[PDB]
Write a protein that binds this DNA or RNA. Structure first.
Lengths: 98, 113, 297, 119
RNA sequence: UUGGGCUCUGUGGGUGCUUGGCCGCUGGCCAGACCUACUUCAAAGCCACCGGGGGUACCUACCGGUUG
RNA sequence: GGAGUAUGGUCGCAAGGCUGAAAAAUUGACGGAAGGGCACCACCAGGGGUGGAGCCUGCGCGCGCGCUACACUGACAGAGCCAGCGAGUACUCCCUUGGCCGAGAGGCCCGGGUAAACUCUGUCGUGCUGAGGAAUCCCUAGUAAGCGCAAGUCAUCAGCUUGCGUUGAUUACGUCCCUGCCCUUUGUACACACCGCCCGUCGCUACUACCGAUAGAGGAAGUAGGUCUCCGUAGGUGAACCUGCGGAG
């Protein structure tokens, strides 16, 4: 039995698949080979609340909407959606008588 | 396991020994196992029943293969013979005993002829 | 396979006899460790067995961790307790009768990961073989008398303990017309246990409550629709199966949906169904002097 | 043991060493460091070599004669034959190490117990 | 087919692609021959595997001192 | 004497009744629509019980559950040929007419109440000599069902339980349409790939203002860039040399 899996992190760069390979006088890879970045567009950027603008919030779709340009109806419904996810996780006698 | 999500899907079971060599039929209809429990085993998974058909052999299994025409399986067992089956009509259709057809030997500290 | 299960099961037995010797030891070792923190003086034999002191210095950490509950004891359950889902089959006796077969259908429904099986013409040794080649948690029998079930027989597989009990006071699912009863929900039921206060009580609760699936632990006290109960008095454990809706944080309503049992367990064996030559653990002792006065559980 | 008793890494490697050696069969329990100390022994290793454990499974009468058998080569492991008479049989492989394909020995056994399949 | 047979036990080639024997080797020798001369200057360093816990008065390794 | 362990008895507290049975919530309460996964308690192909009559354990006269009977798959005569489980010095259905030998208690003897199946050969032929409604409930592979044989295991079970063997089919083996049950619409892993903000009624919270009694609790709503060399200088510690300035290469 090998071991329990201990979590290990390993960093990758922005440089290309040719930078990943080993050493030889040619790249084997084609010409469209080489301009791919070893990471994904997600990695370089995704819109998120954590990178959101000030007056605006991101959508689950990842679309920018301002709270001011927002409607009240959508406001109510997004409050409902967030909450849905959340749930998924002696005195005077005068004063007395009068 | 599921590729697209990673969390475990199904522990198939049925095997009276460790499972020795595995392959999918190239269309993807059938998983085939061979285990050292003298037996080879047709797992049809992606059907709605996830059924199993046994195949009794003569001895332990060692390696499995398919035909690109996905009707035929070739399993290579421990006596050394190949047995060739058609998948659907699970009937054995061919066999080759190739023991002398492969014996070459006499290693160092190999005191048999 | 078969040489493998013979291998492991005997290794369990031999390791138990090992645990007997070493726990007889650790009894002494316990008193040493307490004295160090306490400074209260000790038994002089404990003060002057040299291999004991050195062995203390090695084997401290087991004692303190067991005090912590950091580990669960070596067990035929502790290997796979809350990891993987126990699948369970229910089978009738050899030639079943129809009302019995319906009642077996009922208790298959009460469990959530079960299959029933028509027993038919099947040697019970080969039914054990089917077990240890499909890696079951649990086999379960049923024995009727005349249309009425009488005994069940839980075994824990691959090799674990077996309960064997009579039944009494049974009601079926099928005495009530379907206009009033109905298909019962296959949700993962909770379990509650009342009055098991022997170590033997914990044995029998262990062999019971490792039948059911693992609940998810996040909101389990909040969620859930269905509750199974085991209560016991006069060593006749009574079990009901109820379903409930919570009408308030101060009020709740229950509905009774399963069969009503009382079973009284009369054979508990660290040893499966075929092996009649196995080590029984507690049998029900009538015919003795005070087998009626005392109770276990 | 020198590590203070209350440590995580101590607890983790107590369990690790113990369960690993136990799956190497050289022990007999898996809960006692003192047993690791004055119990783990080259003699126990030798009794988890291959010929000794085939005497224990009762392949052959005396571990000498067992050495003679596996040197001629009737004794398989898994699916391979084995020549090296120090193939340390861990506990998961004691259940498997059995007789080879074309063996006069296996045919002798089937001779005595009267099922002698010539096929 | 005008003896047959088993078993044992030797020798010889084979069981890996064919360039000679020997010696102080650009030559000689296989019958061998000559046999002891000649010299400017010791050295660069490192590493170099004995099963575990344990004691350490004496020996040793090291490190730091002390008189002569 | 000391240290523990028990055991019982003593003592003090607990042991003074504005009282007379029948909430939490920035997290919560409840839906709905879509989409998936499933199931002889769903669909579909069939099969098979019970439910008709008799017997009776059981359960509450009722009620099923088991056993029996009910005819073409017939009856009689032969012939042949197959199982598996079971070994405690242990096993019996009566109870009775007579008689024997038993002074008496008995023991005798005579009377009365290792398989079915299956195959083949041949003889006769529907002949009170009638297979169970509406309902309901169960079943998908050595399974439905048939057939016997044995055991009798500290609970249950001889008005039967449980085993073992024997022969062994049809029929779906797909689909969420009906019935339902569960699960998605959060998280729990990233590449390609794709998807692209579900919807309702209220609660709780902050704020805003309103209303009306006596600063005040209430009611009622909304909002969330000069290096190197050389030279001429001034100072330093002087030959030299350093520092700084100013000029040439």
């Amino acid at each position: 039995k090998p071991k329990p899996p201990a979590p290990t992190l390993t960093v990758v760069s922005d440089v290309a698949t040719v930078a990943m390979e080993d050493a030889q006088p040619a790249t084997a890879q084609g010409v469209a080979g080489g301009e791919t970045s070893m990471i994904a567009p997600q990695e370089v950027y995704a819109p998120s609340k954590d990178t959101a603008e000030k007056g605006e919030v991101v959508t689950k779709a990842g679309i920018p909407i301002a709270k001011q340009e927002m409607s009240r109806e959508e406001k109510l419904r997004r409050r409902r959606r967030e909450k849905e996810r959340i749930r998924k996780a002696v005195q005077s006698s005068g004063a007395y008588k009068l | 396991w599921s590729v697209q999500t990673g969390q475990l899907l199904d522990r198939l079971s049925g095997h009276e020994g460790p499972v020795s060599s595995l392959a999918f039929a190239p269309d993807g209809s059938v998983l085939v196992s061979g285990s050292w429990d003298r037996t080879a085993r047709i797992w049809s998974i992606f059907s709605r029943t996830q059924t199993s058909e046994p195949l009794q052999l003569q001895s332990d299994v060692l390696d499995v293969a398919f035909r690109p025409d996905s009707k035929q399986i070739a399993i290579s067992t421990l006596d050394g013979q190949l047995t060739f089956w058609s998948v659907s009509e699970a009937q054995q259709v061919s066999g080759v005993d190739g023991r002398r057809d492969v014996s070459g030997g006499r290693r160092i500290t190999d005191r048999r002829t | 396979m078969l040489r493998k299960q013979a291998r492991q099961r005997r290794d369990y037995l031999y390791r138990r006899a090992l645990l007997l010797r070493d726990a007889e030891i650790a009894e002494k070792r316990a008193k040493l460790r307490a004295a160090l923190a306490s400074g209260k003086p000790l038994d002089p034999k404990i003060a002057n067995d040299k291999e004991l002191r050195k062995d203390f210095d090695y084997d401290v950490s087991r004692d303190i961790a067991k005090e912590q509950g950091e580990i669960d004891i070596d067990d035929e359950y502790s290997e796979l307790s809350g990891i993987v889902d126990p699948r369970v089959l229910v089978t009738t006796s050899r030639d079943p009768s129809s009302r019995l077969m319906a009642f077996s259908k009922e208790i298959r429904l009460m469990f959530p990961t079960a299959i029933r099986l028509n027993r038919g013409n099947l040697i019970l040794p080969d039914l054990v073989m089917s077990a240890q080649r499909e890696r079951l948690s649990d086999i379960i029998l049923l024995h009727e008398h005349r249309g009425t079930p009488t005994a069940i027989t839980i075994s824990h597989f691959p090799h674990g303990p077996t309960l064997m009990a009579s039944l009494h006071n049974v009601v079926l699912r099928a005495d009530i017309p379907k206009s009033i009863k109905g298909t019962v929900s296959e949700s993962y039921p909770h379990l509650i246990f009342e009055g098991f206060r022997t170590p033997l009580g914990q044995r029998v609760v262990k062999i019971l409550k490792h039948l059911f699936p693992p609940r998810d632990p996040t909101n389990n006290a909040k969620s859930g629709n269905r509750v199974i109960t085991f209560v016991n008095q006069d060593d006749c454990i009574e079990v009901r199966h109820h379903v409930y809706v919570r009408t308030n944080y101060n009020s709740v309503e229950l509905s009774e949906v399963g069969p009503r049992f009382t079973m009284r367990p009369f054979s508990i064996t660290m040893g499966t169904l075929e092996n009649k030559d196995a080590d029984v653990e507690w049998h029900l002792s009538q015919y003795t002097r005070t087998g009626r006065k005392k109770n276990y559980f | 043991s020198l590590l203070p008793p209350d440590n995580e890494v101590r607890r983790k490697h107590e369990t690790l060493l113990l369960d690993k050696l136990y799956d190497m069969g050289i022990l007999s329990t898996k809960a006692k460091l003192s047993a690791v100390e004055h119990n783990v022994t080259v003699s126990a290793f030798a009794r988890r070599r291959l010929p000794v454990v085939m005497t224990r499974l009762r392949m052959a009468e005396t571990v000498q004669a067992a050495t003679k058998l596996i040197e001629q080569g009737h004794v398989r492991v898994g699916v391979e034959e084995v020549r090296d008479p120090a193939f340390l049989v861990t506990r998961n492989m004691e259940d498997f190490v059995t007789w080879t394909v074309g063996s006069k020995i296996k045919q002798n056994i089937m001779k005595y117990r009267d099922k002698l399949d010539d096929f």
